[PDB]
Amino acid sequence: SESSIENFLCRSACVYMGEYHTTNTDTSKLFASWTINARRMVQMRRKLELFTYVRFDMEVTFVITSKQDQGTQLGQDMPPLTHQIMYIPPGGPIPKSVTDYTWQTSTNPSIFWTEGNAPPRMSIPFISIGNAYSNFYDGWSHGVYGYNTLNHMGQIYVRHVNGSSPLPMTSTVRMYFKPKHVKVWVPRPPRLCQYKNASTVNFTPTNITEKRQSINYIPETV
Amino acid sequence: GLPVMNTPGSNQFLTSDDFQSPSAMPQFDVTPELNIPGEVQNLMEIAEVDSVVPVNNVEGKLDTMEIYRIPVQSGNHQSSQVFGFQVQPGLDNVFKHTLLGEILNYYAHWSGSIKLTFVFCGSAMATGKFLLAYAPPGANAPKSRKDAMLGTHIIWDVGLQSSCVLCIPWISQTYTSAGNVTCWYQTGIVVPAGTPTSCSIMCFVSACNDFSVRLLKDTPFI
Amino acid sequence: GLPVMNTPGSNQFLTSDDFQSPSAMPQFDVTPELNIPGEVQNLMEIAEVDSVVPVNNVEGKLDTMEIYRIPVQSGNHQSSQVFGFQVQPGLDNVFKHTLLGEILNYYAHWSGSIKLTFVFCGSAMATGKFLLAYAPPGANAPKSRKDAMLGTHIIWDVGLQSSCVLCIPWISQTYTSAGNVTCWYQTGIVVPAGTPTSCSIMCFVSACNDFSVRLLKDTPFI
Amino acid sequence: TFVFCGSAMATGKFLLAYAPPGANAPKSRKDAMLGTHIIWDVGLQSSCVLCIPWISQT
Amino acid sequence: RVRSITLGNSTITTQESANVVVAYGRWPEYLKDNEATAEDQPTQPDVATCRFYTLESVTWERDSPGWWWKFPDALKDMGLFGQNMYYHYLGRAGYTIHVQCNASKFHQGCLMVVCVPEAEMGCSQVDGTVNEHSLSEGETAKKFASTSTNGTNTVQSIVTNAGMGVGVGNLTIFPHQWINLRTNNCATIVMPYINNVPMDNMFRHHNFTLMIIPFVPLDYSSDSSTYVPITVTVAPMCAEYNGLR
């Protein structure tokens, strides 16, 4: 009953930790970004490789902290900061800067939040025109091996909701991920190799198990 | 209206909570389910499958197929030992990476009973006898064929049976304090003319119907 | 009184929430509704209307009415091709800005079936024949009139019918991997004396009854 | 009807393939496998029977 | 004690005491009526799909790591089944695989016969992309290796990892049979259609892979035959395609 599929997988984990600033000279360090694939968190990856097709809902909680730079200016009296967290479905537009029009589009679901309150949280349905996600794919996209276009699940963008010419602060986000209502099909043998990259199944040859003294060896009874 | 009183535990994010969550895409109808063959409800369905044991895990043969073959030699050697090991899945290197072994390393406490199966892979003209002996946990390994005969044993005649199955009741975890299994030459192998010389034994391990696991943890393999 | 316990998620502003709200003008009676004609319940009611396709979208004629007219020429040319295009709404520039095309660009996944309609706008004395051929997705475009006749086709005689309707079943999105439609001169146009020389074909696209859309997003047009 | 007259200790496999009238003879084992065939294991059967429907002359 | 089976204009003979594995308990069938009811039109040829297609034989010797075949792309030149792979854009099918071998009673050996669904294989070098020609040769079996491979574009086909980074003793989780030469020399596996969509293209996607691996190597003595041939015969079952009208 503790070996049920739901108790084995319905558990939370930190999957991404990014940093983003209020003012900078880089314009890519002004927002935080993460493509959502289930092959780049090594926590849940090996537990999912026991199965061939999976189907679940997704629940995401956010933990956000800030600090003021140690550059020059003290004596401030700042109000609490506001943060925007935008989810893009598979097939939506992608921003390029924090001042883009794409932060304001009516079809990207977004969350606004101010510090001191409870941490924010939203839930995602099973978003696939297919009938299950695919942990394994033996074939081509149309041409990249192993990758198909049915495992698109979206992206996450975070920025500050300041006005104009803000004060210099730097923020950090932790994204916590959790699957719900999980169903699996076609079990597979476990991975007896260390993972090399986050896209393929490539590996180096490793031994089957560890050695002992002889085929008759049994350690002494205490 | 409706006087209300906040209890402690408010506005915390607990990683193991089970609350409702706001959905980010309410105007979305999910794809209906498809009846894919091979649905899994429980991890005991994976542990209750036979898998091949790497018994010959000695120095030199850890990356060849020779690790799976027990080397039966020819001639008259009718008191020597063929093999021996302790029955300790999850800990011992013999049983560590099987299908039952990999599942047991996600849990901290487990207990059940094990089914072993031995298969003689020789030519159809070979005949002979073996003795398969089991000592309970606490007892020492036998040192001769005679005192193995005075315990719990079974005499296996490979000219009449190609396989012999063995159920072991009392299995758990915490210099062994575990049971063990050994095999002894009763007779020796007799062949006619124009046959291969050597012969081999293979071994399969699985779990019986009652098997319990508790306290999901991290796996110590990656 | 009434012991109460705050759960995490308290005092956050989630952009997708659906809570009650305090009204700012409670002593206000709204104007009653008026039965205006033309009420819309669903965006599929807009997509299921015919609209004119700009098939002749070549260089030079993109801001004239000449973009909507297919140029049927006179003489004897009874094997040449009249037009051809892929059936890919939302992506292809032919179908991109129609009434069905503009609705499909608010959604990230869609699938259904399409109705095409062709109208011959010549004089009442012109007669001739055309061949309208459909290739499924995956198949190549035909290169002659003969191999278009060996597929799924229809022979359209504009002296007897002014219009011909065509339903296309398997439509979705993700160098095409889509179906296509082509038109071929079977005979050529025959006129009497004292008639205009050239003639034109127009094309209308709409959506059939079953059409599904998912994952509302931002539109990539402004 | 085909009968294998070997010793009792011999084992192996054969492929018996039939092409209809009009079709060419196969040139490999692979394209004979892509037609109508049967895999005959002489360690388990000593004989294999075969019925052929469309027979005539000119 | 011989049963003879006919499909179309094909006839093979088996032993009627053979033991059959159905893959996950599921026979093949057609997709019923109304999962895509409106305009998605299916059809089935049924005529020259249900007949036995016999591949060639492979030679088993003392040093043979194994053989594998991709399904489909191994039936792409097999007559009418390879024809509908060209004309139709979508399709699905199930299969019945017979594997047979001919040996004496003076030989010994042991085979594993397994059908691995979506056997996604890794490249020989770590930072590389696998080529499609190193995955399949069509009707010709590829070969595993008894040592670790190198070079570029090669599949890391050491037999102990099975090209998948898993332990080869654990492929009993898949539908499998054992062939032990001092017992039976036949194996039959029925394989339904398994995918995450109802139909799909047949040149871009490999559904499953048939693998044959010797655990106990073949050995013989003085004047016996130094080889054993293995024969694979495939019958497509309940195949179905998109409509063209």
At A64 the three-state DSSP class reads strand
Kindly report the backbone phi and psi dihedral angles of residue B177, in degrees, each rounded to the nearest multiple of 5, phi listed first. 50, 40
CA-CA distance, A104 to E62, in Å (whole number)?
Answer: 69
- Spell out where chain C is interrupted, by the residue before each break (C to N > 2.5 A): 174
In this structure, the strands spanning E186-191 and E20-22 are parallel
Task: List chain C residues with CB under 8 Å of A102.
Answer: 218
Subunits that touch chain C (at least 3 Cβ pairs < 8 angstroms)?
A, B, E
At C171 the three-state DSSP class reads strand
Tokens of E123: 């490249």
- Contact at CB, E219 and B198, closer than 8 angstroms: yes
Are the C-beta atoms of residues D51 and E16 closer than 8 Å to each other?
Answer: no
Subunits that touch chain E (at least 3 Cβ pairs < 8 angstroms)?
A, B, C, D
CA E193-C210-A154 angle, to 5 degrees, is: 65
E196 to chain A, any CB pair closer than 8 A? The answer is: yes
Task: List chain E residues with CB under 8 Å of D27.
Answer: none
Tokens of E103: 């040996």
Tokens of A74: 């003290």
Among C6, C16, C217, whose Cβ lies nearest the Cβ of A107? C217
Task: List chain B residues with CB under 8 Å of A208.
Answer: 54, 57, 62-63, 67, 97
Task: List chain C residues with CB under 8 Å of B23.
Answer: 16
- Contact at CB, C8 and B12, closer than 8 angstroms: yes
CA-CA distance, A169 to B146, in Å (whole number)?
Answer: 81
Phi-psi region of E151 (alpha: psi -120 to 50; beta: other; left: phi over 0): left
Chains D and A touch (3+ CB pairs under 8 A): no
Best of E7, E52, E67 to disrupt the D interface (most D CBs within 10 Å) is E52
Give the dihedral of Cα atoms D22, D27, D29, D31; nearest 10 deg.
-50
CA-CA distance, C129 to C78, in Å (whole number)?
Answer: 9
Subunits that touch chain D (at least 3 Cβ pairs < 8 angstroms)?
E
DSSP for chain B, written as a single string: ----BPPTTTT---TT------BS--S-PPPPP---S-EE-BTHHHHTS-EE------TT-SSSGGGG-EEEPPS--TT-EEEEEE--TTTSTTTTTSHHHHHHTTEEEEEEEEEEEEEEE--TT-B-EEEEEEE-TTSPPPSSHHHHHTSEEEEEETTT-SEEEEEEEEEE-----S-EEEEEESS--B--SS--S-EEEEEEEEEEEEEEEEEE---TT-
- Contact at CB, A193 and E194, closer than 8 angstroms: no
CA-CA distance, E73 to E71, in Å (whole number)?
Answer: 6
Task: List chain A residues with CB under 8 Å of E168.
Answer: 208
| Nearest alpha-carbon partner for E170 in B4, C160, B101 | B101
Residue C115: strand pairing partners: C167, C206
CA-CA distance, C67 to C71, in Å (whole number)?
Answer: 10
- From D44's Cα to the closest Cα of chain E, the distance in A is 7
Resolution value, angstrom units = 2.6
Among C152, C170, C209, whose Cβ lies nearest the Cβ of E40? C170
CA-CA distance, A91 to A95, in Å (whole number)?
Answer: 13
Residue D12: strand pairing partners: E103
- Count interface pairs D-E at CB distance under 8 A: 155
- From B22's Cα to the closest Cα of chain C, the distance in A is 6
CA-CA distance, B163 to C158, in Å (whole number)?
Answer: 80
Contacts of E170 (CB under 8 A, 6+ apart): A189, A190, B51, B52, B98, B99
Are the C-beta atoms of residues E12 and E233 closer than 8 Å to each other?
Answer: yes
- Contact at CB, E78 and D34, closer than 8 angstroms: yes
- Contact at CB, C1 and B6, closer than 8 angstroms: no
For B2, name the nearest residue in chain C, comparing CA atoms only: C2
Tokens of C133: 């051929």
At D34 the three-state DSSP class reads coil
| Nearest alpha-carbon partner for B173 in B92, B64, B60 | B92
CA-CA distance, A115 to C12, in Å (whole number)?
Answer: 9
At E115 the three-state DSSP class reads strand
Tokens of E231: 């024969």
What CA–CA distances, in Å, run from E240 to C169, E32, E46, E90? Answer: 17, 11, 8, 9
CA-CA distance, A29 to A23, in Å (whole number)?
Answer: 9
CA-CA distance, E196 to A133, in Å (whole number)?
Answer: 8
Task: List chain B residues with CB under 8 Å of E25.
Answer: 37
Among E107, E146, E195, whose Cβ lies nearest the Cβ of B123? E107
| Nearest alpha-carbon partner for C174 in C116, C108, C219 | C108
Contacts of C25 (CB under 8 A, 6+ apart): none
Are the C-beta atoms of residues A21 and A170 closer than 8 Å to each other?
Answer: yes
- From B20's Cα to the closest Cα of chain C, the distance in A is 10
- From C108's Cα to the closest Cα of chain A, the distance in A is 5
CA-CA distance, B53 to A94, in Å (whole number)?
Answer: 52
Phi-psi region of E60 (alpha: psi -120 to 50; beta: other; left: phi over 0): beta
| Nearest alpha-carbon partner for E20 in E104, E112, E75, E99 | E99
Query: Dihedral sign, CA of A50, A55, A61, A62?
Result: positive
- From A80's Cα to the closest Cα of chain B, the distance in A is 17
For residues E32-51, one letter each, b for 16 or more C-beta atoms within 10 angstroms of the residue's C-beta and e for the rest, the string is eeeebeebbebeebeebbbb
> Residue C17 CB: number of other CB atoms within 10 A?
11
Tokens of B157: 């005649």
Residue C114: strand pairing partners: C168, C207
CA-CA distance, C14 to C16, in Å (whole number)?
Answer: 6
Among B21, B36, B57, whose Cβ lies nearest the Cβ of A123? B21
CA-CA distance, E54 to D40, in Å (whole number)?
Answer: 12
Please report where in the chains the tokens 């009718």 appear, as a residue.
B78
Best of E34, E149, E170, E177 to disrupt the B interface (most B CBs within 10 Å) is E170
D32 to chain E, any CB pair closer than 8 A? The answer is: yes
Contacts of B71 (CB under 8 A, 6+ apart): A215, B56, B198, B200
- Count interface pairs A-E at CB distance under 8 A: 92
Tokens of B4: 């209300």
- Count interface pairs C-E at CB distance under 8 A: 31
Q: C24: which DSSP letter?
A: S
Total residue length of chain E = 245
CA-CA distance, A122 to A59, in Å (whole number)?
Answer: 6
Task: List chain A residues with CB under 8 Å of B58.
Answer: 211-215
Are the C-beta atoms of residues B167 and B115 closer than 8 Å to each other?
Answer: yes
E strands, chain E, where? 3-7, 10-14, 20-22, 42-43, 53-60, 67-71, 91-101, 108-117, 142-143, 176-180, 186-191, 208-219, 228-242
Are the C-beta atoms of residues C121 and C201 closer than 8 Å to each other?
Answer: yes
CA C190-C195-C199 angle, to 5 degrees, is: 65
User: Of all residues in chain C, what percent are helix, strand and coil, respectively (each to 5)?
Assistant: 10, 35, 55
CA-CA distance, C130 to C69, in Å (whole number)?
Answer: 17
Contacts of B82 (CB under 8 A, 6+ apart): B70, B72, B130, B182, B183, B184, B185, B201
- Contact at CB, A203 and E194, closer than 8 angstroms: no
Q: E122: which DSSP letter?
A: P
CA-CA distance, C79 to C185, in Å (whole number)?
Answer: 5
Q: How far is CA A179 from the centre of its chain?
A: 12
Among A residues 116-135, those touching chain B with beta carbons less than 8 Å apart: 117-119, 121-132
B47 to chain E, any CB pair closer than 8 A? The answer is: no
Q: C27: which DSSP letter?
A: S
Tokens of B84: 């021996």
- Contact at CB, E2 and D49, closer than 8 angstroms: yes
CA-CA distance, E120 to E166, in Å (whole number)?
Answer: 11
Where in chain A are the domains? Answer: 1-222
Total residue length of chain C = 222
Q: Residue C65, class by beta-carbon neighbours within 10 Å (0-12 exposed, 13-18 middle, 19+ buried)?
A: exposed
| Nearest alpha-carbon partner for C54 in C12, C22, C90, C97 | C97
Contacts of B99 (CB under 8 A, 6+ apart): A189, B46, B47, B49, B51, E170, E172, E173
- Contact at CB, E204 and A142, closer than 8 angstroms: yes
CA-CA distance, C44 to C12, in Å (whole number)?
Answer: 36
- From C128's Cα to the closest Cα of chain E, the distance in A is 25
CA-CA distance, B85 to B93, in Å (whole number)?
Answer: 10
Please report where in the chains the tokens 């429980």 appear, as a residue.
B42
Where in chain E are the domains? Answer: 1-245
Where in chain C are the domains? Answer: 1-222
Contacts of E217 (CB under 8 A, 6+ apart): B65, E62, E63, E64, E109
Are the C-beta atoms of residues D29 and D46 closer than 8 Å to each other?
Answer: no
At C113 the three-state DSSP class reads strand
